[PDB]
Amino acid sequence: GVNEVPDYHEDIHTYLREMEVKCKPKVGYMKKQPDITNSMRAILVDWLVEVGEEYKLQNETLHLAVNYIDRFLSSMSVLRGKLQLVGTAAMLLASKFEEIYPPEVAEFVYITDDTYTKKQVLRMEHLVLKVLAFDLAAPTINQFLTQYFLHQQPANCKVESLAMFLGELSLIDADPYLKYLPSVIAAAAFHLALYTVTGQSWPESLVQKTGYTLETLKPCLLDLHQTYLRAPQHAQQSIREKYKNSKYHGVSLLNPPETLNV
């Protein structure tokens, strides 16, 4: 019914596909950042995961914030001492965009341990808005995932939660997920989730919707599959901790499959 917008779902999907290309960060920006690294970004993203858990924020908000961070770091050189200020302003903006009840600015100041002032946070908010030119309605992995979900026959909450988890893991590591579009990571995540839980594969019906096959997703899948296998050892662990919760059907406790068989 109308909650799945049947008269507009195609138009929307087509429009997000176009917009994900426009809202895309530069794949090679870390090497051009003098003072920050993939590892510093991973620490930041893993922290924003924890911030969303503490403030009971939508998963969509987290994804928006990272989109904003990556786009910002694509044109703006940032000292490591200021990396977190950017991420805080990013999470505030995402929250004001996406959440019914965003946390107050004071709360954002508080989660930074008074590293930064309220004045610093509000000034970085204006800068990110200037650098992004207010282009905040960015497609996220989640917006694709939720549409992919409508193709499940039948629907499996473990499939859905496990896809959310995997897509979320991908936020942590610019190498190699900066090279892949939201829509392609969501497709890898959905297939990997479906295969893990039920043994089934990317459906004919999503080939029709997306144009993606297992042929075209294979690069992101091989990466995502490694990230899943290695996730217990990753230095960042907030996402796994998060997906132990029953809210997400404890999907981080499922065993990854050893092999994908193409």
Binding site: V2, N3, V5, Y8, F97, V105, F134
Partner: protein
């Protein structure tokens, strides 16, 4: 791309939440614009979420039936939204079109354009969520455009739970009034439905003074809904069995001057069940519009 030194203020023309709207003139190009000032010096939480949604969503919606945001002047204590100027809103026009009434060609033209604008919104994952005549701007050429996207929201598919009790009450869809967990594009259609009726009668179709009075006014016109007309209704969070059960009056009594085609379209806009309620896209093909044109306003 712009600066306030090339604008000349002319007169106040309105008010939003974050301040006044001003008519101004670009001194280099001649263009007439509306300036919406958003207070930031007074803002202790930074840029308002209303403004962030308004600006981000409007930069993407380039359509002839959506008010065009031309520019954003980001000073340090001030934020100025530059829109194309339109002369009047639909509410002012309806009040000045009394005694004569709005001519059907123009009602039909305006409704048609409104549907084009809303459909374009819905096609770009955008709910307007405050459609009412005060927020629909008309020009001297015959255009009408959706405006005030301050309560608007980017939706995902399927929708999740968004802010409750949105839409000015007289225009709020029943599924919001019943506190449903999820609402979708159909809430905007409901608003246009009310507006359609309103253009014909020049008075609001459901002028309630409370959420419950609003429901009861709706029920007394469309009949109290049950599981047959609207499966789920008796389960909705704020459905109550004690609701009086009113008969659906014949729909030709709701808006007597309306013709067969108009009635058909209005009934489909005010269907209880958000799943059966017509979409903006489908409504464009309805025979009501078989002879539609774009005439200038008569006044």
């Amino acid at each position: 791309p712009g600066s306030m030194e090339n604008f000349q203020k002319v007169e106040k023309i309105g008010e939003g939440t974050y301040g006044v709207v001003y008519k101004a003139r670009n001194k280099l190009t001649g263009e007439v614009v509306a300036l919406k000032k958003i207070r930031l010096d007074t803002e202790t939480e930074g840029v308002p979420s209303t403004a962030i949604r308004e600006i981000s969503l409007l930069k993407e919606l380039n359509h002839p039936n959506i008010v065009k945001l031309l520019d954003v002047i980001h000073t340090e204590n001030k934020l100025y939204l530059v829109f194309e100027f339109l002369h009047q809103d639909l509410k002012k026009f309806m009040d000045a079109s009394a005694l004569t009434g709005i001519p059907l060609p123009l009602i039909k033209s305006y409704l048609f354009q409104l549907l084009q604008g809303l459909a374009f919104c819905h096609s770009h994952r955008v709910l307007h969520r405050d459609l009412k005549p005060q927020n629909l701007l008309i020009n001297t050429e015959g255009a009408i455009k959706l405006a005030d996207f301050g309560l608007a929201r980017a939706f995902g598919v399927p929708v999740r739970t968004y802010t409750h009790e949105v839409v000015t009450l007289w225009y709020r869809a029943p599924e919001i009034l019943l506190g449903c967990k999820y609402y979708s594009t159909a809430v905007d259609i409901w608003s246009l439905g009310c507006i359609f009726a309103e253009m014909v009668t020049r008075r609001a179709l459901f002028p309630g003074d409370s959420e419950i009075d609003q429901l009861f006014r709706i029920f007394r016109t469309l009949g109290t809904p049950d599981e047959v007309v609207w499966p789920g209704v008796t389960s909705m969070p704020d459905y109550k069995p004690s609701f009086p059960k009113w008969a659906r009056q014949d729909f030709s009594k709701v808006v007597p001057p309306l013709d067969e085609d108009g009635r058909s379209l209005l009934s489909q806009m005010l269907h209880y069940d958000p799943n059966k309620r017509i979409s903006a896209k489908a409504a464009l093909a309805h025979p009501f519009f078989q002879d539609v044109t774009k005439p200038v306003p008569h006044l």
